[PDB]
Structures are given as structure tokens and as C-alpha cells.
Amino acid sequence: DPNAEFDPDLPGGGLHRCLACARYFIDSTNLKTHFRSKDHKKRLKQLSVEPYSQEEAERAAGMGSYV
Ligand SMILES: [Zn+2]
Known about the structure:
Double Stranded RNA Binding Domain; binds zinc ion; Zinc finger protein 593; DNA-binding; nucleus; transcription; preribosome binding
């Protein structure tokens, strides 16, 4: 199909998926918000899907900026 790097049937063009869920998300933000389930990534660690997942190898726990 002319001009379509994405798929028009799949949410998010089928380009944003959680492989562990086989679900297609409309946007990467929606997809990444989906991994905010700690138990999921826990299962991922057990299954060996992705060792060191989000909130661990990508954490919002820092920011050491003083004047
Ligand atoms: Zn998932």
C-alpha cells in the first residue's frame, strides 16, 4: 500500500507492541505505561524475556540537582 510504514488495522500501526502481551498500543507512551505493572516485568525476569527492565535499568529515581 502506498505510503504506509504502519498498519491501518493494528493500533499504533502495529508498531508499538508489548511482545509479552501480543497487544498493540496506539502509542509508545501507552505501551511504556503498560509496563508499570511490577508483577509483569517480574514475570518477564522469570521467563528471561528482558533481564533488567523498566524502573530498574531505566529509573525515575535520581535527580541530584542543587543550585
Ligand atoms: Zn505486557
